[PDB]
Design a protein around this ligand. Structure first.
Ligand SMILES: Cc1cc2nc3c(=O)[nH]c(=O)nc-3n(C[C@H](O)[C@H](O)[C@H](O)COP(=O)(O)O)c2cc1C
Ligand SMILES: Cc1cc2nc3c(=O)[nH]c(=O)nc-3n(C[C@H](O)[C@H](O)[C@H](O)COP(=O)(O)O)c2cc1C
Ligand SMILES: Cc1cc2nc3c(=O)[nH]c(=O)nc-3n(C[C@H](O)[C@H](O)[C@H](O)COP(=O)(O)O)c2cc1C
Ligand SMILES: Cc1cc2nc3c(=O)[nH]c(=O)nc-3n(C[C@H](O)[C@H](O)[C@H](O)COP(=O)(O)O)c2cc1C
Ligand SMILES: Cc1cc2nc3c(=O)[nH]c(=O)nc-3n(C[C@H](O)[C@H](O)[C@H](O)COP(=O)(O)O)c2cc1C
Ligand SMILES: Cc1cc2nc3c(=O)[nH]c(=O)nc-3n(C[C@H](O)[C@H](O)[C@H](O)COP(=O)(O)O)c2cc1C
Ligand SMILES: Cc1cc2nc3c(=O)[nH]c(=O)nc-3n(C[C@H](O)[C@H](O)[C@H](O)COP(=O)(O)O)c2cc1C
Ligand SMILES: Cc1cc2nc3c(=O)[nH]c(=O)nc-3n(C[C@H](O)[C@H](O)[C@H](O)COP(=O)(O)O)c2cc1C
Ligand SMILES: Cc1cc2nc3c(=O)[nH]c(=O)nc-3n(C[C@H](O)[C@H](O)[C@H](O)COP(=O)(O)O)c2cc1C
Ligand SMILES: Cc1cc2nc3c(=O)[nH]c(=O)nc-3n(C[C@H](O)[C@H](O)[C@H](O)COP(=O)(O)O)c2cc1C
Lengths: 142, 139, 141, 140, 141, 139, 147, 136, 140, 150
């Protein structure tokens, strides 16, 4: 019913290739529009960080389906709450890799909101997660 | 006396034609100026979403007249409260249709405040309804 | 779906007797329960002040039905909004008459939230109506 | 329409007596009920401090009538504003005299909101005025 | 003593001419400098809306003088309070007529803070009055 | 690491029996202490509504273990967030239906639209307040 | 006009005797109540800490009178500002002495608001000074705090 | 060693000549910089109004020195308190026509002549900050 | 000069005996009074949790002298800041050891602010730490 | 885990030449990146004022290592608390000499937050130190002013 946001992180499996993230993105871009789901996925080997926005029932359907995926494990819900309005509404889904090859502007962003230059969501509170995702969206948009 | 704003939604009757939407707009534009009413009507098949601003007595009189209109049914008052100042003061009544022929800019605005690309007032709270309406008035 | 409150006032017909009010109470106490509606009606000749709480769809269904009642006219919605929780949850409906013959305590309460000792709903803001209705529900009344 | 409170002070004519305050009281208690006015009057030689509460129009009517009374001059409105609810509702009007011969508990209240033990409205702000009057009403 | 603002409205007598408002304006612009009074007056037939600023003592002195004026009646104090700083300090007094001949911009402003396009202080709360006066003075300029 | 609270609802299977409720209770009370999980489970046929409290990692492990339970479906997370202190800090379970006391029904009505518990129609604050109030009036 | 509070500290001249302290408090009892001043004087040898509340003009007249007293030097205004209401109550006739033979309760109160068991106003902010003075007035029981 | 602000008013002696104000100016400009005192002294016959900013001990030393000055009497501390930061990066003096100045004295007080006894601390501060702007 | 609080946690060395804890507590109760330090110490093997109150200079000198003690390592400052007033003014130092054991009175407090019944400082933010210590002292 | 900021001041040894400051900056810039530490060091003879930001564990590790440096003594922690985001994230370490030879612009920032034109960290409360440091970081591009002063 109500407009909702869910932020979670997970451990990618050890063997993940760049093609595996193309298969996640394409699936998400195929399923998400029809469900009202918008969002952003960050990968920083081996951690995933994703925000999902949408009707509560749809966000939940999508999350609990994602939890069942064989390409990641130990999902940790970081925040889930009703929202006043969407922030990621221009993307059914988008994917960003944050690594050592990343732009200095991007590295300085990871640091602005966390302890290290490599993204580790398990060490960030919901507001730091949301703000990182907002700012990094802002520099890859659209 | 007191300046008020009422937001409500309703379900248009099934066979609502383009002429129907036009005479609703024409009625509101001739009646509202005289009663101090301003606002915006949005129509998203089959739902209507309207904000009315004016003196409490006038907003109530206007609203209870609209309620009796044969072209819609099941009105749902979403918010009715006194307000500090108007936001739609330049329009006695403005109408927008939000549908599959709407621009990505509109579809995106509907998405920003709700579960889908199609407007469904029943799935929005008062602040979401008002902000959608304020933003769409800002094209 | 969501929990709502609607407060409104109306003008009763000049022809309102003991039996018409009791008929309103009876109808409301019969219909309100099945629809999850709770609240309180006050009658201060000639005015009605009523508060309705419940699911948005129900509140609206009940209100728009009440507006068709020939026993009053010129309904004025005072406030309609989502609420954190109910305050009248114990009564599907109750009806108080507030007038000249009312208790000094009740009179003083009316004066607490308005200009006079006779209840005139069109001279109160939403917070004053609500608090009046909360305090008089507590007295009983 | 709107519920209002008006607080003002004035200078009473030099030699006001218990009886002068008694008929002010009797005048107010007959007039105030029908106008739905409530409130409290303080006299601290030589000055008056009154709060009036009621419908905007009635508060204004009452105040502007009072201004014309011969028993005082130089009225100063301290505060006039809409209010959420009344604080002096049980009293159409009461009068308390506050002087050097008062109770120690009342004297202590004067001191709490002002520079001296004599009540001097002109030397108090709107919040100090209302608060004095609220505490004063509380011990009555 | 303290810096104060008083806002009131009143009813002008039935047939006020532009010359009466000039006289009012001239009287105020001669008396107000010396008393440190500043403010703005609007006339919206038949009503007056004025804001006065100055020392509490002088603001009361001026207001109780104005109230004796035979050119209006039934004065209503809308607000009287201390203030941190003046907003009308550039003008000893200015007078503006707000009626059905004012510009669209002025009419729109009246609508922004009130139920109609004609200015009726009785229909406005103190915040609405103050904001109307700040905004209209800004256009004037 | 961080003290968290998660509130969710779900749909019990149609053939749930009081013995299943007792089995859920036995299991919880065996698993929760060692994991430092506290909270309250409520059952209003066919709906469950649970709040969990404890460390982030343990709330997540317990929640995702619960999601796989075949005695319910369609979980819907209502709120998940860090908290400054526990409210419950003693798993208790309670069933809340149209046979519960007139005291419980009045409590259901206080936070929602009807006398029967329907979490889908309550926001996070109403859910939590309901659970506290229902716990308060029990043990 | 306005209701004011002033808190100040000073350094009493060396070897101030109890009779001098008595002379000061006799003067302050003589003048303060007539001037509508309430407050307290504390003495933690050699330092004075005093609060004065009352009408701005009186608090100032009193303070600038005190400044000229030859029995202390280096006055330091800690705070002076308009207040919404008084927190003392009366002018405390008795001064409080706060030193190393003070009760464990008084010493604990000094420690609650500063770094040590001896009272050093130069180490405290205006709110610490006020709260100390309020708590000590409560224990003595000179005043509290209009109930 | 806390950063502090003190605002006070006083009445200049009836005999105050332009050279007295010049004397005050030159003493303060020699002393204040070495004591880390910034602020502003305004004089409009017969009132002085001054803000001093600096370390507590210096602000107090400077103020109580000023108190002993024979060119004014009846000092009234209007405010004295710790501050988060300074608002005057330098020290200045201004003696107060025209209408801009009229308008300014009015903006934060009841009359068109400067009367500190009728202004609260925030009014005094903002007046002093603004008058530094219309000059200075 | 200024009134400060510092809360820190550290890791005791593997083989601490109850005697060593007495030696720390005795040393602290000997040294703190003269430096104006008050506070509270817990040992939940292996973790130490201490709050130190006092003048900034003394709090720091004591903290840094403590860091050098051979009976713990890895000190983690959790919060350090000026405070309005002390909350532990009555104790030069008190030590809470395994009457952390007190079943669901003290264990009840630990759960109230953290994930488990056993006290682990690294699992608590500054506010949870202070509130725990405040509640624990209250019941003493 | 938690993102933290630590501000402290210490007394530098009376010897310190520009090479010593360079050696300090050099170690910090080599060590800090790996540790996720960022911040700013000011040297106002004889005093240092530093802010460190990073993970609580790493900030603490770095700080207690620094305390053991023979080039200063009497370290005083001014504030240590969790933070919502970094403010000094641009440099692993930036170091600025702030003294009587400083620009009038710098001396004005010093005076804005304290009693005098000479930076004396103990004459400043935590918010004053913080704001002072933020204002300095604002005006200095370059990770130091030892080679060029603006
Ligand atoms: C990190 C991660 C994030 C994912 N995010 C989404 C999502 O945004 N939307 C979605 O439909 N599937 C998402 N999935 C993919 C689904 O788990 C699953 O692969 C998808 O339902 C396959 O559907 P398909 O066969 O139609 O392509 C995600 C998977 C992973 C591992
Ligand atoms: C969704 C909808 C919105 C309407 N909004 C307004 C309105 O804002 N103002 C108005 O006067 N009439 C409004 N009406 C039109 C009235 O229902 C009614 O037809 C009209 O006031 C008739 O006036 P007339 O008979 O003079 O043409 C609305 C009708 C519909 C169904
Ligand atoms: C002032 C007033 C208040 C009323 N309030 C309610 C109400 O709370 N609930 C309700 O069902 N009917 C209420 N009604 C009565 C309805 O108008 C209507 O008569 C009722 O639904 C008739 O149902 P019945 O024919 O089954 O008796 C109210 C009527 C009036 C005049
Ligand atoms: C300070 C003071 C307060 C007064 N307050 C009231 C009042 O509250 N209500 C009122 O009717 N008259 C009040 N008056 C008295 C009126 O001025 C006047 O005497 C009286 O209302 C005349 O009424 P009467 O013709 O019924 O005797 C007050 C007079 C004074 C000087
Ligand atoms: C609505 C209106 C507003 C007025 N405002 C002022 C005012 O601001 N200042 C003033 O001195 N007189 C004002 N007056 C005029 C006075 O009522 C009065 O006639 C005038 O001050 C007489 O003073 P004089 O005899 O010295 O000329 C106003 C009058 C009206 C009716
Ligand atoms: C709606 C519902 C709520 C549950 N809540 C909890 C819980 O609070 N803690 C828990 O350990 N298991 C909970 N479970 C039970 C688990 O799903 C699972 O059956 C159980 O933990 C297995 O433990 P066991 O086999 O060792 O007994 C819940 C199950 C259901 C269906
Ligand atoms: C530390 C100290 C505090 C004082 N406090 C007050 C006081 O609060 N009120 C007062 O009148 N005099 C106070 N005085 C005394 C005055 O300096 C002065 O001696 C007094 O005004 C003399 O009045 P007398 O001539 O009646 O004795 C204080 C003196 C000292 C040194
Ligand atoms: C109203 C007024 C304001 C003053 N302000 C300052 C000041 O800010 N700084 C200062 O050193 N002296 C100020 N003084 C001057 C001192 O009273 C004193 O005369 C001066 O500091 C003596 O220094 P000199 O002996 O070197 O000339 C002020 C004096 C007056 C009357
Ligand atoms: C965890 C812990 C807490 C301590 N707390 C204090 C303290 O609060 N005050 C203190 O003086 N020493 C404290 N110490 C002990 C000092 O490190 C040191 O051993 C002792 O104070 C030296 O004094 P002594 O040689 O006179 O016995 C603490 C030590 C440990 C490891
Ligand atoms: C005031 C001052 C600040 C310092 N700041 C840091 C710092 O931020 N990071 C760091 O690694 N070392 C810092 N140090 C230097 C360390 O104490 C130590 O010399 C260095 O980390 C050892 O690194 P090395 O392997 O190059 O010898 C600082 C030293 C001083 C005296």
């Amino acid at each position: 019913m109500s407009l909702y946001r869910l932020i979670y992180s997970s451990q990618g499996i050890p063997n993940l290739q760049p093609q595996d993230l193309k298969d996640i993105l394409e699936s998400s871009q195929r399923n998400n529009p029809a469900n009202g789901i918008t969002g952003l996925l960050c990968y920083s080997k081996p951690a995933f960080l994703q925000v999902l926005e949408g009707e509560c029932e749809q966000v939940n359907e999508t999350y609990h389906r994602i939890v069942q995926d064989e390409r990641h494990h130990s999902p940790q819900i970081i925040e889930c709450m009703p929202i006043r309005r969407r922030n990621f509404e221009v993307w059914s889904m988008q994917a960003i890799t944050v690594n050592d090859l990343s732009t200095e502007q991007v590295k300085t962003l990871v640091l602005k909101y966390s302890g290290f230059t490599t993204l580790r969501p398990s060490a960030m509170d919901p507001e730091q997660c949301l703000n990182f995702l907002l700012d990094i969206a802002k520099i890859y948009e659209l």
